[PDB]
């Protein structure tokens, strides 16, 4: 049971107004993956929680393209399968990505090995009729996938 | 119950290898925040879950810095409470940025307005290997964060 709710931007702004009114300098401390030392927690005037922070949805396709690149890059070829070689297609609604990643993602993709049979395809995101939006996004996703094996990530 | 476990990289590699041995092309579909159309779900051979993809730790300070910026921008236009103003420090263990986001986080920081009394202080992260007394690494990091904080009011986030 937590004595507080996740901050709004206006609620956070109101918290900042209280700090400005007070006027004393403020330090907000964030540790590594394992959190903070005892000494940090003991010295705090206020202990806040990052447990409601989530992955922004535009980064889902970024994390997934990285996962796929990392996994492909340790697969071993099959010098016995004259297959129609398998091609992998990431089809994602292209919700707008933060500034700090939007262009790094593009250069990150362009550094994928040429030998990697991967393409990323980004569907225009509908302008938010939720149901007709999803039908139209799905129409294009299915056009791209064609006769492929379809895996959804929901 | 979910009939699968979050992939790590060797497990996803084995999955990709199974697709290679099968040979048919594969499409992986990711909707927007509202998800996927019924036609898409009806057509899926498998339906996978993104519910375990978490915020990478290095982006925590990025999202906190962004929140503070967006919150600060809507505080009182510029009528400040005094000519001895509150300064805010974001003191954060600087774990290494993912490759796709690499430089970007520093240009975003540069684009902050000069009149926003916000400053990011990155504390060097301990080497987190197999050995690694994670208690010691935490004590040292914590020591450096406390030194940066000085006599400020200290707000922790964990």
Curated annotation (Swiss-Prot), chain B:
**Where is the protein localized?**
Cytoplasm
- Could you list this entry's UniProt keywords, alphabetically sorted: Cytoplasm, Methyltransferase, rRNA processing, S-adenosyl-L-methionine, Transferase
The EC designation for this entry is 2.1.1.177
Principal place where this protein is found?
cytoplasm
* Residues that coordinate or bind S-adenosyl-L-methionine: 31, 50-55, 157
Instruction: From the UniProt record, list the reaction(s) this protein catalyses.
Output: pseudouridine(1915) in 23S rRNA + S-adenosyl-L-methionine = N(3)-methylpseudouridine(1915) in 23S rRNA + S-adenosyl-L-homocysteine + H(+)
Any one GO MF annotation of this record: protein homodimerization activity
GO BP term, example: rRNA base methylation
Cited SUPFAM superfamilies: alpha/beta knot
Q: Quick one: effect of changing residue 57 to A? A: Decrease in activity
* Top-rank taxon, per record: Bacteria
Listed under GO cellular component are:
cytoplasm
Q: What is the effect of changing residue 80 to F?
A: Loss of activity
InterPro entries named in the record: Alpha/beta_knot_MTases (IPR029028), RlmH-like (IPR003742), tRNA_m1G_MTases_N (IPR029026)
Per its database record, what is this protein's job?
Specifically methylates the pseudouridine at position 1915 (m3Psi1915) in 23S rRNA. Specific for fully assembled 70S ribosomes.
Assembly with partners or alone: Homodimer.
Q: Which family does it belong to?
A: Belongs to the RNA methyltransferase RlmH family.
Recorded hits in NCBIfam families, A to Z, give: PRK00103.1-1, PRK00103.1-4, tRNA_RlmH_YbeA
- Please report the name of this protein according to its UniProt entry: Ribosomal RNA large subunit methyltransferase H
Q: Give the encoding gene's name.
A: rlmH
């Amino acid at each position: 049971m937590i004595p507080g709710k996740p901050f709004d931007t206006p609620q956070l702004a109101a918290e900042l107004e209280r700090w400005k009114l007070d006027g004393r300098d403020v330090s907000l401390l964030i540790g590594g993956p394992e959190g903070l030392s005892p000494a940090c927690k003991a010295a705090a005037e206020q202990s806040w929680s990052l447990s409601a922070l989530t992955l922004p949805h535009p980064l889902v396709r970024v994390l997934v393209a990285e996962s796929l690149y990392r996994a492909w890059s340790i697969t071993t070829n099959h010098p016995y399968h004259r297959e129609g070689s398998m091609k992998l297609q990431l089809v994602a609604v292209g919700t707008k990505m933060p500034d700090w990643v939007q262009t790094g993602f593009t250069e990150y993709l362009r550094r994928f090995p040429k030998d990697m049979p991967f393409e990323l395809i980004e569907i225009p995101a509908g302008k938010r009729d939720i149901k007709r939006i999803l039908d139209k996004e799905g129409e294009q996703m299915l056009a791209a996938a064609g006769k492929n094996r379809i895996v959804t990530l929901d």
